[model samples]
Every structure is written in structure tokens, then in C-alpha cells.
Target: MADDPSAADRNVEIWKIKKLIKSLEAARGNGTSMISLIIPPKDQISRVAKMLADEFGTASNIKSRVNRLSVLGAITSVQQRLKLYNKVPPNGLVVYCGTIVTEEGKEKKVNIDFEPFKPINTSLFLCDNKFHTEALTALLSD
Candidate 1:
């Protein structure tokens, strides 16, 4: 830990893991939509940054998270060299969006694509807690 360590300006992308699982649980709709995470040209991140403005709320926030995640050993830079994808219409790619888990005695870089199976229309999804469920039911009854 140097006094002033150098850093890379990175960006982070978040996803609704639970919501995605709900969308995949039942046959009410299409199975799954493939979401790709691609690194754009050096100058393009600012332009493409608008696609996810609400989450981090600003471009600076996105870059800061990315930098922090990288510092935590969650992700690595691939600008130097990237693996070639030779497959045609590559399979469903769920990009791990969060920073790597760096807690000691815990898994590092927890790359995962699923949340616990939660029924979408069930009380849990719509209204998990007692207050929410009861309030929701009362509202519906009204």
C-alpha cells in the first residue's frame, strides 16, 4: 500500500440478478435474453456511459467503482490482449457486473449467473415482508 498508488480509471456495470432469475423461472415469456459486455474504444466509454446513468448516477461514479473493483482484485484489464470468440452466435453470456468479492476466507472473483429460485408471482417477489404483503393485499382488495 503505497502512499499514492497509481490506478486505472474503470467503470462498473450492475444487473438485476434476482429479477433475471424470475424472468427465467416460468414459461410466461421468452427463456433468456443474451446480454453482452463489451469494451469499447478508449474514447467511446464516455459516449456509451449514458446507457447506465441512473444506477451509478454519473460517469465519474462509474469510473470510480470500476477503479475500486479493480483495486479489490475483482476484475482485470483486457485492453492489452483479449480472447478471440470463434463461436458463431455465442451462447448466453451473463456478464459478472459487480466488483470481485475480496473478503478473506471467502471466494475471490465470485463469477456467478443465478440467484436463488424465487417465484415471480409469489408473495415473496411481489411482497416479501409481512408489512409489504399485508399492505399489498389490502391495496388490492380496495
Candidate 2:
């Protein structure tokens, strides 16, 4: 590959990911709630980014790109709130929050909702090595 224009910025992004992973690992051992879920192959990352934007206020214009950093920041914000409330995921039913988009594309932060019976969650559970079946069911049943 030719010299990468974004390489300089890329290192910062990589460090952020590493830091998140490190924090997650530490939390797992400290009685903190840590749920590791995968983004399914069928789910477009852009769609998730849009969802995050809708649920959380959109990033400032300079950081509007919905790449890893923005998405992780959203997740981190939720994690901090959960920690504040001592709401650990008891059995893998992690609670995630974000802002939602209004009809006119205005950003109004709201909690991200989950669909229990959706094919996406089903597929995600299938791929996961371990998950809380009853907890997941009870959560999305509402």
C-alpha cells in the first residue's frame, strides 16, 4: 500500500481501542459489569453509527464521522452511567444508552431499544459462546 494519509491519526485510534480493551478486561475482574458482544456480519456499521447518532447527540461537526472512536465513545458514556448506578449486567444483559434522531434529523439523545425476537438478536445469541437467555428474554419482552 502507498503511504497512508490517515496513518498519523490511525495510531491515536488504535491506542483508544487498546485502552478500551484494557479497561474492559480490568472491569471484568473487579466485579464490574462487562458484557462483550459482537457486531454481526449482517449489521452494517454505518447503520449502528446512525443509530448511535439518533440515540446520542451527534458528534460535533469536526468529529462527525461514525467510525470506531465515536461509536466507542458512545458505549463508554453508557458504561460510565451504568457504573455510576452500580447497574452491572448480572447475566449478560448489558444496558446500552444513546441519543435518538428526531423527525427532522435533529439529535435528541435517548436510550437505545432492543428487539428480543428480532433475527439480529437471535443470530447474535447463536454466535455467542455464553449469554443469559432468561435475562435477554425478560429484557426485550417489554
For each candidate, what is the lDDT?
0.26, 0.36
* Count of backbone collisions in candidate 1: 0
Q: RMSD of each candidate?
A: 18.9, 17.7
Candidate 2 colliding pairs, count? 10
The digit string of per-residue lDDT tens for model 2 on 1-142 reads 2466756654554354344333332322211122223332344434443443443443344354553444455456654534454322212123333343345546533332222222333332121112334424443344
Q: Count the backbone clashes (under 3 Å) in each candidate.
A: 0, 10
Collision pairs in model 2: 54-99, 54-100, 54-101, 55-98, 55-99, 55-100, 56-98, 56-99, 99-109, 99-110
| Candidate 2 lDDT score at position 90 | 17
Q: Which stretches of candidate 1 lie over 4 Å from their true place?
A: 1-92, 97-104, 112-142
Question: Residues 22-128, candidate 1, lDDT per residue (tens digit)?
Answer: 33222121211112233212223333324333323332355556534442331222111122221212222222222222235333222333211221222221101
Which candidate achieves the best lDDT against the true structure?
2
